[PDB]
């Protein structure tokens, strides 16, 4: 269990990747 917790917080840091890189807010020049 000391384990799953180091894993759990791991899967999130990769889940955050995907979601940050593929679901980010657009950088547009519409301005």
């Amino acid at each position: 269990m000391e384990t799953i917790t180091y894993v759990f917080i791991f899967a999130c840091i990769i889940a955050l990747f995907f979601f940050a890189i593929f679901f980010r807010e657009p950088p547009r020049i519409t301005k």
Binding site: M1, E2, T5, I9
Partner: peptide, 30 residues
């Protein structure tokens, strides 16, 4: 092995509070 079980609760709340916190604010934003 021997670990202090309070760590879990500590380390889980660290993950949630500040996170929950920010989760509330990103919704009010939209």
């Amino acid at each position: 092995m021997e670990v202090n079980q309070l760590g879990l609760i500590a380390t889980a709340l660290f993950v949630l509070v500040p996170s929950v916190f920010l989760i509330i604010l990103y919704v009010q934003t939209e």
